[PDB]
Design a protein around this ligand. Structure first.
Ligand SMILES: Nc1nc2c(ncn2[C@@H]2O[C@H](COP(=O)(O)OP(=O)(O)OP(=O)(O)O)[C@@H](O)[C@H]2O)c(=O)[nH]1
Ligand SMILES: O=C(O)C(=O)CS(=O)(=O)O
Ligand SMILES: [Mn+2]
Ligand SMILES: [Mn+2]
Ligand SMILES: [Mn+2]
Length: 620
């Protein structure tokens, strides 16, 4: 009801009907419509006709270009200030601070950024009132996970960016059918705005609308709401990926008893016809997508991909830890992808793929550093800054965090159970990061408690994913440091509690390091497809083969236990060298980190493993 006509937005709907929306869905749409004041309201249906109209619209607006060399591939160049996640401006709103982060013993919490409701209300009222003036508010109904899976969650994202809508059609399952499955059930509320209401006060760079000064990515897990403003790039705008499927999902997983982790899922088959599934948690820009799509160099071995970034795991009635990929596509880093490193990715991104901030060749193709592919004579390269680029310049032709957005079903080695609603049984979990020194190539945990300690003690040199710089070894426990949704001490206690469940079939826990260098700064391990030799040893350990050797840090492969045939130049002494001087300093850094960041919320079982490791190292 109303006294005038200022609340009924039915006259602004250009596709769909507010009358056909569920009541709680319509309240969420009309409520924010009155606040953001959009010129139009577009209810997405996920059809090919709608996807084609948005591509044509963005091309006419100068947002995206058509890559004429491939089949339905598009290039988008963004503002140089809006190129990655902004971890510093990502906050979690809870009534009590201890719900979000463990109260630090002295320093500042590196495990999350908390903000009170009172402070966020002021930051919200200074950004969103009238932010969509003259723009179209798109309503995106999407489902994370197979539409029908028990662990499937439905979300509604409001946004004023057609680039977000197009990307969400690739990365999630979006359409009219998601609204039918929702009904009057619960959904996650997602609100996004680029923060450029018309008329524009500031001219846009590369026709990319963004507001870097007022960028804010807020999470309210008690309200099931995600509110993002100012950014339209990747993890900031695609609210169903990092904000939903990791931060909010980890909170829900703790409440409901499952797991939401920053892990890939791959299935590997041996020449004897046995197939196992593995999960691996690597930090951002550390090799997850390359591992999940690996072309193995060992004959008779095959790798199939279930997912490359996010995993939702939960025990079943039989005690098996089952995992699903809640995503629908791949949002992977472009630089470094070549026919040598990731040939299965090259086959995937040749059609129906949206590229962001990669270089364009004059014949209509893509180009980036590490592509390992020469060009034809007369072919010129246009950098991501929309400028002419020659190999003589200092700057790279593609941004380090440039991405491709391709459907998962196009991957030639996609696992036939990647859309199965029951999930795949995980028999192994892999941790690791970028360590240039000290950490051996691979080792195996001694128990479930030691394995949880291994994940909590993860460290890796700073990459180019967030906004950190410099060669600095930083802590990244479970590769979840920028994505924790609640107290990290309670996160560890949730992982340790898995060993208390009846009939539980706990997987083995391994730690790898593809990035160990020698004294020359050269990589000691070739990596990429050669990592199948490391996965071969894991496969045998899960079966129970006697190919392990006990060390002060865990189980390492025996002498002549790794298939190193063909790589006769590998320095096995330096690949598995365990220096006591290095590990005395390493445990000191882990002790100082866990004591300050977790403090009174640290489970005793984690402190016991820290004591045990330091004792075994002292006896060396
Ligand atoms: N030396 C070495 N480098 C690798 C290996 N695998 C991947 N890399 C490099 O590490 C970078 C990380 O690539 P990704 O697999 O996309 O990183 P990611 O873990 O998926 O990170 P996100 O996509 O942000 O979640 C790539 O650009 C590769 O160049 C490897 O086995 N050995
Ligand atoms: O940061 C990561 O690990 C990503 O996968 C990229 S984004 O989706 O967070 O932009
Ligand atoms: Mn126009
Ligand atoms: Mn990731
Ligand atoms: Mn990836």
């Amino acid at each position: 009801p109303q006294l005038h006509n200022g609340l009924d937005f039915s006259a602004k709907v250009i596709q769909g009907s507010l009358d056909s929306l569920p009541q709680e869905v319509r309240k969420f749409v009309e409520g924010n419509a009155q606040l953001c004041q959009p010129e139009y309201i577009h209810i997405c249906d996920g059809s090919e006709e709608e996807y084609g109209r948005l591509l044509a619209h963005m091309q006419e607006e100068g947002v995206i270009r058509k890559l004429k060399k491939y089949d339905n591939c598009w290039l988008a160049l963004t503002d140089p200030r809006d190129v990655a996640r902004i971890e510093s401006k990502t906050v979690i709103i809870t009534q009590e601070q201890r719900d979000t982060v463990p109260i630090p013993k002295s320093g500042q919490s590196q495990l999350g950024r908390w903000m009170s409701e009172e402070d966020f209300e002021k930051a919200f009222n200074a950004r969103f009132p009238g932010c969509m003036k003259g723009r179209t508010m798109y309503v995106i109904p999407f489902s994370m996970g197979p539409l029908g899976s028990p662990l499937a969650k439905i979300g509604i994202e409001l946004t004023d960016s057609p680039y977000v809508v197009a990307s969400m059609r690739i990365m999630t399952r979006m359409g009219t059918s998601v609204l039918e499955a929702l009904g009057d059930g619960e959904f996650i509320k997602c609100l996004h705005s680029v923060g450029c209401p018309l008329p524009l006060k500031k001219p846009l760079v590369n026709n990319w609308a963004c507001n870097p000064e007022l960028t804010l990515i807020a999470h309210l897990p008690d309200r099931r709401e995600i509110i993002s403003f100012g950014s339209g790039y990747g993890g900031n705008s695609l609210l169903g990926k990092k904000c939903f499927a990791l931060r909010i999902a980890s909170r829900l997983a703790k409440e409901e008893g499952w797991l939401a982790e920053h892990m890939l899922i791959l299935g590997i088959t041996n020449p004897e016809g046995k197939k196992k599934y593995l999960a691996a948690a690597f930090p951002s820009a550390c090799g997850k997508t390359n591992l999940a799509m690996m072309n193995p160099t060992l004959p008779g071995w095959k790798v199939e991909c279930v997912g490359d970034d996010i995993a939702w795991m939960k025990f079943d009635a039989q005690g098996n830890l089952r995992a699903i990929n809640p995503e629908n596509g791949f949002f992977g880093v472009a630089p470094g992808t070549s026919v040598k490193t990731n040939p299965n990715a090259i086959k995937t991104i040749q059609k129906n793929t949206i590229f962001t901030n990669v270089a364009e060749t004059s014949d209509g193709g893509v180009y980036w550093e590490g592509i390992d592919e020469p060009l034809a004579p007369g072919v010129t390269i246009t950098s991501w800054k929309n400028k002419e680029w020659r190999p003589q310049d200092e700057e790279p032709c593609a941004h380090p965090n440039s991405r491709f957005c391709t459907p998962a079903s196009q991957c030639p080695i996609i696992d036939p159970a990647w859309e199965s609603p029951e999930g795949v049984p995980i028999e192994g979990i892999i941790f690791g990061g970028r360590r240039p020194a000290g950490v051996p190539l691979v080792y195996e945990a001694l128990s479930w408690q030691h394995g949880v300690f291994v994940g909590a003690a993860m460290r890796s040199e700073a990459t180019a994913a967030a906004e950190h710089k410099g060669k600095v070894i930083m802590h990244d426990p479970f590769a979840m440091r920028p994505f924790f949704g609640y107290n990290f001490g309670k996160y560890l206690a949730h992982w340790l509690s898995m060993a208390h469940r009846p009939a539980a079939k706990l997987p083995k826990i391994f730690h790898v390091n593809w990035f160990r260098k020698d004294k020359n700064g050269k990589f000691l391990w070739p990596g990429f497809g050669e990592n199948s030799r490391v996965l071969e040893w894991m496969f045998g350990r899960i079966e129970g083969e006697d190919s392990a050797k006990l060390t002060p840090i865990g189980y390492v492969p025996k002498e002549d236990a790794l298939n190193l045939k063909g790589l006769g130049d590998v320095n096995v002494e330096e690949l598995f060298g365990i220096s006591k001087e290095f590990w005395e300093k390493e445990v000191e850094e882990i002790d100082k980190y866990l004591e300050d960041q977790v403090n009174a919320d640290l489970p005793y079982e984690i402190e016991r493993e820290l004591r045990a490791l330091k004792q075994r190292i002292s006896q060396m």
